[model samples]
Target: ELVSAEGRNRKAVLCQRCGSRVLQPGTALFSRRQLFLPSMRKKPALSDGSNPDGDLLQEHWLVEDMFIFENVGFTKDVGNIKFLVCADCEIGPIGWHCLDDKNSFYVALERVSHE
Candidate 1:
């Protein structure tokens, strides 16, 4: 099924790192895949040693406004992204995966008790 955003930017998008409000409510969230890659795979490696190209969506973002990206060869697609992060900690470029500006994934999930 195709996913669509709330379509009105009124909800704040926060940094998953430190819970800071980096982006104000003016962007929408959208996706094309179901379950947002609930399964994990080995992310393709970057020669630059920057980002892992896989397994963490910590948050969703609008590709059109929130980010300015460069080419990353990790995916077969055009491979452009800002590698999103915490606006508070300045921790990273946390998200903005694209399959043509309508579909994406971000992984911040439920935790289980473990030792």
Candidate 2:
């Protein structure tokens, strides 16, 4: 969506990192895509308060990898995002973003995992 000059100023306050004044008022900031929706099912059972069991009960849903954006400024569109899971853990995100207003946008050139 094209943000109006005023909208840009307004978005500045809601910035994920820096304030809006640093963001170009009418420029494309970043584009986003819905990577996943909360949808997963598992049988409910009593909690044993142990390691694996406790973790299983705490999980309500699972989202596959969904890419949000690559670069920061000069918005661009991306295709389906990818997510992954391992035998013992669930990764949170795998993507890239500009380090700051002055950086060229960082790329996830490599995969990273989060526990």
Candidate 3:
């Protein structure tokens, strides 16, 4: 869970992937995976009319570079991953990955299209 220090309430933001909401104070949280179906088709690219990268699938490496994994001490295990490209823009919503540790997985970050 991510916490926003600036907010008035000390509510921890629940995982968007799992839909677990913060309930009581001082609650301990652990992450787990539930079964989900893989998407059948590729997402279509967005046509914002402003973005030059229009309608192209954004590579996972590009996201890794933008997030600066090296600086943050994070490395993506490229093999065990999948991406949900935007239907319109084809931008990825921080791809999902099953970590080597097996105890956790993550959704990178929601990247907005430049358009």
lDDT: which candidate is best? 1
Q: Model 2, stretches more than 4 Å misplaced? A: 1-20, 35-115
Write one digit per residue (lDDT tens) for candidate 3, span 1-115.
2322431113332323333331222222222233221332234557534533312222211221223121122223334544333333233333334444342323222222110
lDDT of predicted model 1: 0.35
Candidate 2 residue lDDT tens string, 55-78: 111111111112222222321222
With candidate 2 superimposed using the best TM-score fit, by how many Å does residue 68's alpha carbon deviate from the native?
19
TM-score of 1: 0.37
lDDT per residue as tens, model 1, 33-90:
2222212223455564554444443334343543322221112232444233333343
lDDT pick, better of 1 and 2: 1
